[PDB]
Amino acid sequence: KQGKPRLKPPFPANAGLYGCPTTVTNVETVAVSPTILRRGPEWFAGFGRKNNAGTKLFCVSGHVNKPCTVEEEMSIPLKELIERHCGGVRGGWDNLLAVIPGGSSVPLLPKSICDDVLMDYDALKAVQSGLGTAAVIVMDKSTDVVDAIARLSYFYKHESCGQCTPCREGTGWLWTIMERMKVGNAKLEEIDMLQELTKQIEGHTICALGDAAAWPVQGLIRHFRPELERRIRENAERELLQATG
Amino acid sequence: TEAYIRNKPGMVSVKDMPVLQDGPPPGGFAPVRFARRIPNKGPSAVAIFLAAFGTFSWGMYQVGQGNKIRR
Numbered sequence: 436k437q438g439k440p441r442l443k444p445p446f447p448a449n450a451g452l453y454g455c456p457t458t459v460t461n462v463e464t465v466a467v468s469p470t471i472l473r474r475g476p477e478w479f480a481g482f483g484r485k486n487n488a489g490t491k492l493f494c495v496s497g498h499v500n501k502p503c504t505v506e507e508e509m510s511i512p513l514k515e516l517i518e519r520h521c522g523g524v525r526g527g528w529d530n531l532l533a534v535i536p537g538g539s540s541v542p543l544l545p546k547s548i549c550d551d552v553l554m555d556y557d558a559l560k561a562v563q564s565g566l567g568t569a570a571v572i573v574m575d576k577s578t579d580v581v582d583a584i585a586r587l588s589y590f591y592k593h594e595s596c597g598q599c600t601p602c603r604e605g606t607g608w609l610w611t612i613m614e615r616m617k618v619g620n621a622k623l624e625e626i627d628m629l630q631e632l633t634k635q636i637e638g639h640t641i642c643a644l645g646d647a648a649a650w651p652v653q654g655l656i657r658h659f660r661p662e663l664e665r666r667i668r669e670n671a672e673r674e675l676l677q678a679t680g
Numbered sequence: 681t682e683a684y685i686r687n688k689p690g691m692v693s694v695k696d697m698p699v700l701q702d703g704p705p706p707g708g709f710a711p712v713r714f715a716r717r718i719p720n721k722g723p724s725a726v727a728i729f730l731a732a733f734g735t736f737s738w739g740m741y742q743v744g745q746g747n748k749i750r751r
């Protein structure tokens with residue numbers, strides 16, 4: 436049938452693929468299973484940290500000199516990873532503006548935070564974000580962060596299939612608001628409305644794509660309010676100056 | 681559903697948005713009067729009484745002179 440999700444109370448352990456007991460696992464875990472089961476679980480637990488352990492392969496791409504994908508152990512400082520395996524950012528902690536640790540479904544990490552955050556399931560999970568798929572993205576000081584977030588929200592609009600209403604409607608709306616905020620055609624109460632919409636969608640959808648559509652804009656208006664307010668103020672001033680003629 | 685309807689032109693926030701122009705001008709227009717005031721400036725007692733009595737006496741004198749002429 437069409438690619439639409441189900442309701443969870445029949446968890447896919449007693450009513451799954453054909454109604455049979457069927458579980459879904461990512462290719463990561465099921466592909467790592469043989470060697471972890473052969474080389475003993477202690478050799479595995481001897482990595483990462485106490486509650487987060489194992490070797491995960493990150494795919495670092497975006498605004499680095501050498502876009503790469505390499506496997507490291509969890510709880511690795513972002514500085515260490517980027518500066519060691521991948522190429523150093525065009526300016527090492529100089530023109531690096533934003534970092535998205537997880538996939539596109541994870542709130543941002545500004546420059547001041549990510550200098551000394553560990554890379555595991557808990558450290559940045561405690562900061563605000565989530566490791567998710569561990570696809571770290573970096574964005575220099577010469578890239579409109581609000582434009583990147585708007586493009587991500589457009590993607591989420593173009594992917595939410597639309598079974599239940601919150602995700603569908605709210606995602607179209609979020610893309611529209613993010614475009615208007617990219618150009619600068621809004622007010623401040625509009626960014627508070629953005630936060631409110633984010634909260635509603637995140638709360639009340641079927642499964643995690645609602646949270647996916649809500650998280651990036653939430654992190655944006657959490658860690659990047661001043662520049663957004665500056666864009667709004669400059670557009671308002673330019674509009675007034677033009678209207679005076 | 682209120683921002684541009686109320687006022688679109690140039691505000692930066694929802695406050696200081698509209699222009700209303702509803703009530704009174706600055707000053708309350710006036711202090712007004714509400715208490716009655718009826719001035720009593722007519723000739724009060726002795727003026728009117730002397731007028732009546734004097735005109736009566738003089739009219740009687742005139743009637744006398746006239747009846748003299750008519751006789």
Ligand SMILES: Cc1cc2nc3c(=O)[nH]c(=O)nc-3n(C[C@H](O)[C@H](O)[C@H](O)COP(=O)(O)O)c2cc1C
Nearest residue numbers: 459460461462463464465540568642643644645647
């Ligand atoms: C919006 C959305 C996107 C997802 N994308 C992926 C994906 O790219 N790969 C994947 O294996 N699972 C994806 N999932 C499913 C979850 O990651 C699911 O927990 C996972 O397949 C099973 O977890 P595990 O195998 O790590 O235990 C997605 C789920 C949602 C709601």
Ligand code: SF4
Nearest residue numbers: 597598599602641644
């Ligand atoms: S965004 Fe949510 S409610 Fe919509 S199709 Fe995806 S899981 Fe379903």
